């Protein structure tokens, strides 16, 4: 309310004059994705100022951007998936980014959950060979067969616990054998849920198997050389 | 509102009001005015207070034409914020929500009246009649039993009203103790709050609560500050060292392990004297 009958409070005693000129003193920086993805160049972010090169460096090192894999890969069939990246190194209006985490969208999760089946959730923690302590959540629904006349398709608790055991072992084995870049390359084309289904085709027939969530928990010592390598030197112009 | 439908209980109200012809009566809630014309016949001066202008015009049109209109006076407006003159008898038929602060104002009134015939709920009447050792004993019960003497008169059914309400009513009599016993109302009030925040626990635990100890610490601190001495230093909280002090006063009084619903007026007076002697003041 900015009405004349809005009763004045302590509030607006001493203001400030809008002279900061903020989007003239601020500066645009383009970010870039790791080389594992197809279309790396995505968007531009805003740095507060340039008097503090320390300020630019620290803000861009703290940046945690989020995109969706459909727009990142050109195939709009990855609409539900979504990743989070975090920027860690800068070089001249261009930023090098690395993987930070993953999620679905809540509309996809709500559309997955149905009313005549059981949900199974596996919740594992691991550390890859790149020493990224990580946590992976997966879900799987108990579908019905091609001959099913029963309404529901519920699984017994023994089958649920057995499938949790199999999925936990699968996730731990593959993401311990892999590295973080290799993990992203496994995580893009949905191969891990395919492996889970191919293994648990004999316990109980499932559907909608998905690695629901990836969560980084620790980060190792820095390696700008590894960053430059997984991403893919520059001289001046002799100002006088 | 609610309309009375028993002139026999009106007779009962007047006959137990026991009016002397030299009195002035504060009448709250005349309604249609049967009690009004009765006490106009009985006493010397009648002050009828009212908040409803329609019922006030009804009463003044019913009364205009009598010779006792020289004695009748009607005051319009809320009487909880306006001045009320001296009255010897007080008779009240209001809805009870203003009647509880009416009771406290009539208690704290300078030159309090002789007697007051009030109508109440059955529950509220038992609350005023609550003796110690009884389950309805509360802060208001102890306050009215301290500052005055109350006694039940009669019980009114919900069917004796048009339209009938949901709660059964009663008629009670309040007599202010003249003179007032010289105890600080504020200190008695603070002690009664602290002991009656839970009426069936122990008084030691009721003091063992936190914010009560905060209040008592601030009170004793400003008391020792105006008396201009200093405390001894505590290893923990000042609330804890005054908690130790209240522990001392409780183990000398030996009432700390007692039931607040069973401790009568005299025990509270002894305890507040102990607090006043050790230097604790709740206000």
């Amino acid at each position: 309310a900015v009405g004349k009958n809005k009763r004045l409070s302590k509030g607006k005693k001493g203001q400030k004059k809008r002279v900061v000129d903020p989007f003239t003193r601020k500066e645009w920086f383009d970010i870039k994705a790791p080389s594992t993805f197809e279309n790396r160049n995505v968007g531009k972010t805003l740095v507060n100022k340039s008097t503090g090169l320390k300020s630019a460096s620290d803000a861009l090192k703290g940046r945690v951007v989020e995109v969706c894999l459909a727009d990142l890969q050109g195939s709009e069939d990855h609409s539900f998936r979504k990743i989070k990246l975090r920027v860690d190194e800068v070089q001249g209006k261009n930023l090098l980014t690395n993987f930070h985490g993953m999620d679905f969208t809540t509309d996809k999760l709500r559309s997955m959950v149905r009313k005549w089946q059981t949900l199974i959730e596996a919740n594992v923690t691991v550390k890859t060979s790149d020493d990224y302590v990580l946590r992976i959540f997966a879900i799987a629904f108990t579908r019905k067969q091609a001959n099913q006349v029963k309404r529901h398709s519920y699984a017994q608790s023994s089958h649920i616990r057995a499938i949790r055991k199999v999925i936990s072992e699968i996730l731990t084995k593959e993401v311990q054998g892999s590295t973080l870049a290799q993990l992203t390359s496994k995580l893009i084309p949905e191969v891990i849920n395919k492996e889970i289904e191919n293994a648990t085709k004999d316990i109980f027939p499932l559907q909608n198997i998905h690695v629901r969530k990836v969560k980084l928990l620790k980060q190792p010592k820095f390696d700008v050389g590894a960053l430059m390598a997984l991403h893919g030197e520059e001289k001046g112009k002799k100002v006088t | 509102q609610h309309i009375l439908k028993n002139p026999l209980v009106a007779q009962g109200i007047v006959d137990k009001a026991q009016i002397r012809p030299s009195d002035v009566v504060l009448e709250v809630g005349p309604g249609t005015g049967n009690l009004t014309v009765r006490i106009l016949e009985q006493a010397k001066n009648v002050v009828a207070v009212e908040m409803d202008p329609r019922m006030a015009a009804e009463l003044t049109k019913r009364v205009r034409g009598t010779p006792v209109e020289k004695k009748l006076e009607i005051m319009l407006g809320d009487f909880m914020k306006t001045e009320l003159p001296y009255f010897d008898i007080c008779i009240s038929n209001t809805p009870y929500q203003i009647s509880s602060p009416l009771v406290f104002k009539l208690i704290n009134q300078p030159r309090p009246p002789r007697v007051s015939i009030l109508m109440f709920q059955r529950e509220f009447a038992l609350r005023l009649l609550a003796r110690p050792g009884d389950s309805l004993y509360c802060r208001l019960s102890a306050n009215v039993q301290m500052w005055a003497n109350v006694t039940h008169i009669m019980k009114v059914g919900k069917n004796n009203f048009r339209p009938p309400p949901q709660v059964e009513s009663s008629v009670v009599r309040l007599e202010i103790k003249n003179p007032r016993p010289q105890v600080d109302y504020n200190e008695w009030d603070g002690l009664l709050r602290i002991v009656f925040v839970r009426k069936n626990r122990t008084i030691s635990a009721g003091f063992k609560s936190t914010t009560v100890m905060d209040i008592l610490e601030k009170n004793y601190k400003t008391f020792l500050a105006m008396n201009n001495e200093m405390v001894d230093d505590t290893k923990g909280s000042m609330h804890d060292v005054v908690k130790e002090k209240i522990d001392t006063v409780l183990k000398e009084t030996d009432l700390g392990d007692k039931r607040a619903g069973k401790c009568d007026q005299n025990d509270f007076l002894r305890l507040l004297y102990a607090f006043h002697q050790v230097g604790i003041h709740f206000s």
Binding site: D77, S79, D107, S111 | -
Partner: protein
């Protein structure tokens, strides 16, 4: 410059979509100029607007709200009304968002909202000029802003347990003053 939206459909509302699809696309393609596809492999409806054939910018969002109302389960003519006007809104809330009810009491609460053969529900409809849809727990109200507000008030009183006689008296009072204004 084309522009695309997608929207899912749950299966229990996918059967009426197939059943009455032929009365859905003519207003989208004829009065909105909105290319429509339906991916039955992803159970979704896609509305893409063409850079040259369309006129209005808000046509895409109007069509998306149209299909969204039909998805949530309103009738076809009512979602057509949402397309037809510009100030119809859809509101949704739940019985556990009003008061936590445990099972059998929740069943009786939906019974009190629905009333014997939808009598109380259609009373709220005709009184406040809205459309009410009761899912399992979620409930949906379509109409103008103040109308769905008053309908929400009546429904919430019904949930808290006001009998249908009292809430019906309040409905006819608010409908009297709304007809007078």
């Amino acid at each position: 410059k084309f522009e695309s939206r997608k929207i899912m459909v749950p299966p229990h509302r996918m059967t009426p979509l197939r059943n009455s699809w032929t009365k859905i696309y003519p207003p989208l393609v004829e009065h909105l100029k909105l290319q429509v596809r339906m991916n039955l492999k992803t159970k979704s409806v896609e509305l893409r607007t063409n850079p040259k054939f369309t006129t209005d910018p808000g046509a895409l969002q109007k069509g998306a709200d149209f299909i969204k109302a039909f998805t949530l389960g309103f009738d076809l003519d009512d979602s057509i009304a949402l397309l037809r006007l510009d100030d119809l809104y859809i509101e949704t809330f739940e019985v556990k968002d009003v008061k936590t009810l445990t099972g059998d009491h929740l069943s009786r609460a939906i019974g009190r909202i629905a009333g014997k053969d939808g009598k109380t529900k259609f009373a709220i409809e005709n009184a406040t000029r809205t459309r009410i849809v009761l899912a399992d727990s979620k409930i949906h109200i379509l109409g103008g802003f103040t109308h769905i507000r008053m309908a929400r008030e009546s429904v919430v009183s019904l949930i808290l347990g006001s009998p249908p006689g009292k809430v019906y008296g309040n409905l006819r009072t608010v409908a009297s003053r709304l007809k007078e204004r």
